[PDB]
Amino acid sequence: EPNKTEIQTLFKRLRAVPTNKACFDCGAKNPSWASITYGVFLCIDCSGVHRSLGVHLSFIRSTELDSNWNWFQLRCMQVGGNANATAFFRQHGCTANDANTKYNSRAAQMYREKIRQLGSAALA
Ligand SMILES: [Zn+2]
Numbered sequence: 001e002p003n004k005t006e007i008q009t010l011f012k013r014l015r016a017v018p019t020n021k022a023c024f025d026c027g028a029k030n031p032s033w034a035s036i037t038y039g040v041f042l043c044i045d046c047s048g049v050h051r052s053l054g055v056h057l058s059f060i061r062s063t064e065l066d067s068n069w070n071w072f073q074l075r076c077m078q079v080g081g082n083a084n085a086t087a088f089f090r091q092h093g094c095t096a097n098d099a100n101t102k103y104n105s106r107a108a109q110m111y112r113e114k115i116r117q118l119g120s121a122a123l124a
Contacts, residue, residue: 001070001071002069002070002071002074004067006074007067007069007074010074010077010078011063011064011077014041014063014077014078014081015030015032015041015063017081017083019081019082019083019086020041020081020082020083022082023041023042023043023046024038024040024041024042024046024082024085024086025042025043025046025049025097025099025102026043026045026046028043028045028046029043030043031043031046032044032062032063032064032065033046033047033060033061033062033063034060034061034062034063034077035050035058035059035060036059036060036061036073036076036077037057037058037059037076037112037115038058038080038085038108038111038112038115039076039077039078039079039080039081039084039085039115039119040080040081040082040085041063041081041082042060046099047060047062049099050099050103052099053099053100053103057103057104057108058103061073063077071123071124072119072120072123073119075118075119075122075123076115076116076118076119078122079115079118079119079121079122080115080118080119085111088107088110088111088114089102089105089107089108089111090107091107092105092106092107092110092111093105093106093107094106094107094108
C-alpha cells in the first residue's frame with residue numbers, strides 16, 4: 001500500500017499542474033480535496049457539496065489530511081485531473097454548474113466508468 005512519502009510526492013506533482021489549481025466545480029484556488037470518482041480536485045466548500053451527492057455519485061477524500069489512499073485511488077487522480085474531466089464533460093454534453101445536475105449527467109456516468117478503466121489499466 002502506498003506510504004506517506006509516495007502519496008505526498010505524487011500530489012505535489014499533480015497539484016503543480018495549473019489546471020489542477022482551480023476547483024473543478026467553482027474555480028476556487030488551490031483545491032486540496034479530491035473526488036476520486038472523477039479524478040478531480042475540489043475546494044473545501046465543494047467537497048461538502050459532494051458529500052450530499054452520496055458515495056455512489058462522488059467518493060471524496062482529502063489529498064492533504066488523509067493518508068488512506070490506495071494505489072488505484074492515486075492512479076484515478078493521475079489518469080484524471082481537472083483538464084481531462086472538464087474536456088470530457090463538455091464533449092459529452094454537460095456544462096451544467098449545478099452539482100446535482102452535473103453529477104447525474106450522462107457525461108458524469110460515462111466518465112466515472114472511464115476513470116475506473118484508465119485507473120485500473122494504470123496499475124503495475
Ligand atoms: Zn469549489
